[PDB]
């Protein structure tokens, strides 16, 4: 018959869209200052017969999280003390003590001329530094990067401890969540739910391994932006934790001086007791099981009859060639060798593992040119317990001309850490208006 246009409003149709999401949380550097109280029990509606496509590599939510984190880090340093007066001749000598030693010269005993509350007077002080914190002028020393940037002291009252952050949609928008398992972050998701907000995600800063993240539901999941391109990082999510115990055994003390009328500076004082190298302990047997699971899953993509090898990074900056921690307010760099030293031919390698670590007080967390922060030293012995929840691997081969392939730890790009948690979420815009042919007529 004669079909007619009809109009419906409230129609359950959505489109791909990008919009700002807002944070929620349950002193501290993190977002909780900008955030609002959370929904203690976010609602989830399961949708049957929905096959909505997800693509984590294009997900805008990653960029929003990144920008919030950069702004927060900087915001916490705005009221804090400037250390510009510290760029001085800084003469130093060897620390002599009861030591197990380290690289020679790792600790230095330095003395220098500082300003006082009155500009009319100067004072002489001494302090201990790590070799990484200083460079030779030509003995005479200079604080590292005095030739590149101003250094700001972190405020001692501000914790760096992570706070879980939830993101919530604005009105007219909804967040879809993939419920599938063994999902590689792309393609159609067979089961989809709708949520007002995301699960809480802790900010974590680390390299080569992922800490305090979510676990895979059943089996280890391997994904990458382009598996055929060796340049791309491969992310591996574990279905089990591996516990790691890290420590800073030295009994450091903290001393302070007033600089100028408006500020004060904290520095490392005499160290009490034997001086020992920082280190981390992991179970060998647990790690061995973990590698066996990763290798088995790699073969599913790279095929059978391959030899899988692991090796340490061949070179590049200390910031990316080593594992990084921020714990206790101290920054650790660890070699990781002995975790990644193996060859797997016969589904087997052809107590604890102790890794060496180093401490640096002057850092640049986001790798920005012209920026620097000085952490104040933390008094007493520091112990940290955390769990490894994933790995970042790279191919140093791309080999097609052999039966072998070798993997090395990746790093230097923070976006890959956040992608491991946000891959399940997609943002869509709701469009309530639509039309249909159903017959009807109106009087005029």
């Amino acid at each position, epitope marked *: 018959e004669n079909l007619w246009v009809t109009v419906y409003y409230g129609v359950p149709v959505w489109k791909d869209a990008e919009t700002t999401l807002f944070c929620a949380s349950d002193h501290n550097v993190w977002a909780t200052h900008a955030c609002v109280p959370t929904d203690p029990n976010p609602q989830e509606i399961h949708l049957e017969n929905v096959t909505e496509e997800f693509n984590m590599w294009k997900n805008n939510m990653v960029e929003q999280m990144h920008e919030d984190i950069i702004s927060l880090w900087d915001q916490s340093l705005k009221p804090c003390v400037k250390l510009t007066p510290l760029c001085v001749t800084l003469q130093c000598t060897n620390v002599t003590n009861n030591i197990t030693d380290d690289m020679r010269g790792e600790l230095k005993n330095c003395s220098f001329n500082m300003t006082t509350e009155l500009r009319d007077k100067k004072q002489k002080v001494y302090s201990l530094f790590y070799r990484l914190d200083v460079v030779q002028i030509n003995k005479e020393y200079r604080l590292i990067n005095c030739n590149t940037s101003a250094i700001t002291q972190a405020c001692p009252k501000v914790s760096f401890e992570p706070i879980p952050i939830h993101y919530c949609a604005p009105a007219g928008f909804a967040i879809l969540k993939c419920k599938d398992k063994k999902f590689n972050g792309t393609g159609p998701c067979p089961s989809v739910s709708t949520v007002q907000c995301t699960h809480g995600i802790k900010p974590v800063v680390s390299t080569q391994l992922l800490l305090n993240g979510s676990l895979a539901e059943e089996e280890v999941i391997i994904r990458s932006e382009n598996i055929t391109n060796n340049a791309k990082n491969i992310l591996v999510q574990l279905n089990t934790p591996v516990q790691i115990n890290c420590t800073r055994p030295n009994n450091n003390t903290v001393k302070s001086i007033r600089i100028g009328p408006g500020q004060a500076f904290y520095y490392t004082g005499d160290i009490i007791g034997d001086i020992r190298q920082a280190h981390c302990n992991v179970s060998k047997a647990t790690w061995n099981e973990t590698l066996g699971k990763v290798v088995k899953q790699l*073969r599913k993509h790279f095929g059978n009859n391959t030899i899988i090898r692991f090796a340490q990074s061949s070179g590049g900056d200390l910031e990316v060639t080593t594992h990084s921690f921020n714990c206790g307010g101290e920054f650790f760099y660890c070699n990781t060798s002995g975790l990644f030293n193996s060859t797997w031919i016969s589904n087997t390698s052809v107590d604890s593992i102790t890794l060496p670590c180093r401490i640096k007080q002057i850092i640049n967390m986001w790798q920005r040119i012209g920026q620097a922060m000085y952490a104040p030293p933390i008094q007493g012995v520091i112990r940290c317990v955390s769990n490894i929840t994933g790995l970042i691997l790279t191919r140093d081969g791309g080999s*097609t001309n052999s039966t072998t392939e070798t993997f090395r730890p990746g790093g230097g790009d923070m976006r890959d850490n956040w992608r491991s948690e946000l891959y399940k979420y997609k943002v869509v815009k709701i469009e309530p208006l639509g039309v249909a042919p159903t017959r009807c007529k109106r009087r005029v």
Partner: antibody, heavy 121, light 111 residues
Framework: EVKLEESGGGLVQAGGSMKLSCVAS????????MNWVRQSPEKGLEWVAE??????????HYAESVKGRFSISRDDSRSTVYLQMNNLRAEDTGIYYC?????????????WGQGTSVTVS | DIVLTQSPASLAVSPGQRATISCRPS??????????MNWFQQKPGQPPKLLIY???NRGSGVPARFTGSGSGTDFSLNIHPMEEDDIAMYFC?????????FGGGTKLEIK
């Protein structure tokens, strides 16, 4: 139970062309690796072709004796492997087999199909 | 290519005696401390069956009488006791590199 079945063999005039096929069964073709070999009493066993998986960009390798006259390709969605050949010579006469690498690390032809006769004249 | 030499071309062995077949690669087959030499057994009308892998490991389903040996560029297959069921062509293979190579197949017979 892993099985391979060859087809497409038979007598072909020299300088001509033909396609051989192998049907995979009992395993996922997409996650393994495939190889072709040939045999004649005149020469014994000879390896002729290999095909890689997607991360390897489906790269292929050929023996110098067959290179440029033979080509290997696969269809992961149909569980099949194909060996294309042209510019055939009498020297190519022999029994062709679809094979599997088997044991990991210790690459070896652990599984073979029945094979098929190819004759060139 | 890496050339394999295999000998004897043929041998006749009485039942209950040990048979040996040698194989000598032009280049070492070894890698990562492990040999990559393989051996096959074949009977007429049938595809070859993997006999030995990694120069020492019997293939699955292979009888104890078949033993691999050697390292570097010197390998051999040792069969004992000889039985009529063992009459077959035998081949050595180098799996270490592409192209993989075969050659010099040997005929083993009952005396």
């Amino acid at each position: 139970e892993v099985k391979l079945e060859e087809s497409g063999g038979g007598l072909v005039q020299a300088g001509g062309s033909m396609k051989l096929s192998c049907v995979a069964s009992g395993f996922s073709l997409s996650n393994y690796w495939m190889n072709w070999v040939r045999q004649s009493p005149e020469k014994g066993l000879e390896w002729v072709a290999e095909i890689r998986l997607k991360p390897q960009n489906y790269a292929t390798h050929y023996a110098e004796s067959v290179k440029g006259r033979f080509s290997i390709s696969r269809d992961d969605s149909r569980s099949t492997v194909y060996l294309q050949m042209n510019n055939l010579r009498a020297e190519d006469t022999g029994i062709y087999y679809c094979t599997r690498p088997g044991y990991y690390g210790h690459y070896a032809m652990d599984y073979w199909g029945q094979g098929t006769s190819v004759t060139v004249s | 290519d890496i050339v394999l030499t295999q000998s004897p071309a043929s041998l006749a062995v009485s039942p209950g005696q040990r048979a040996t077949i040698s194989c000598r690669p032009s280049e070492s087959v070894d890698n990562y401390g492990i040999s990559f030499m393989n051996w096959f057994q074949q009977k007429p009308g049938q595809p070859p069956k993997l006999l030995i892998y990694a120069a020492s490991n019997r293939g699955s389903g292979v009888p104890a009488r078949f033993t691999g040996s050697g390292s570097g560029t010197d390998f051999s297959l040792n069969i004992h006791p000889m039985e009529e069921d063992d009459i077959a062509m035998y081949f050595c293979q180098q799996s270490k590199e592409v192209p993989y190579t075969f050659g010099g197949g040997t005929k083993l017979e009952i005396k």
